Ligand binder design. Structure first.
Ligand code: NA
Length: 134
C-alpha cells in the first residue's frame, strides 16, 4: 500500500469478523503526534491530548489523576499494558491505543461493540506494523 489511509480503512474501520459492526473511529499517529491517517469520524483531538498519551506510553500511570481526554471527552483509564497498550472507557464505549516503534494506533468504539473487539482490531494492526519494523 502507498497510503497510511489504507491501513485505517482496511485494518481499523472494516467490518469486524463479518458481524456488520465497526469501530466508531480510528487513527494512526506518529510518536511525534503527527496524523498519518484518520477516519473522517475521528474526533477533533487537541495536541495536549496526544502528548498526554505519548507520555503515558513512556511512563504508565500518569493519566490517572486527570483521565484520558480525546476531543474534549473524558475516558476513564482501564487496565492496559505498560509501554504497549492504553485503554479507556466512557459508558458503553471506549478507546484503545497500541504503541509501535514509530506510531500509535487508535481505535474508538461504542455500543454494541465490546472492549475486547476494539483491542483485537488495534492490537492486530500494531503487531503487523511491529513485524514490518514500524
Ligand atoms: Na466530526
Amino acid at each position: 500500500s502507498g497510503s497510511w489511509q489504507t491501513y485505517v480503512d482496511d485494518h481499523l474501520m472494516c467490518d469486524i469478523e463479518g458481524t456488520g459492526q465497526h469501530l466508531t473511529s480510528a487513527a494512526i499517529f506518529g510518536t511525534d503526534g503527527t496524523v498519518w491517517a484518520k477516519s473522517a469520524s475521528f474526533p477533533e483531538f487537541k495536541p495536549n491530548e496526544i502528548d498526554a498519551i505519548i507520555k503515558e506510553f513512556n511512563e504508565a500511570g500518569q493519566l490517572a489523576p486527570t483521565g484520558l481526554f480525546l476531543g474534549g471527552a473524558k475516558y476513564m483509564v482501564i487496565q492496559g499494558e505498560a509501554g504497549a497498550v492504553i485503554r479507556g472507557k466512557k459508558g458503553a464505549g471506549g478507546i484503545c491505543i497500541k504503541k509501535t516503534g514509530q506510531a500509535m494506533v487508535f481505535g474508538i468504539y461504542d455500543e454494541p461493540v465490546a472492549p475486547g473487539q476494539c483491542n483485537m482490531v488495534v492490537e492486530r494492526l500494531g503487531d503487523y506494523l511491529l513485524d514490518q519494523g514500524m
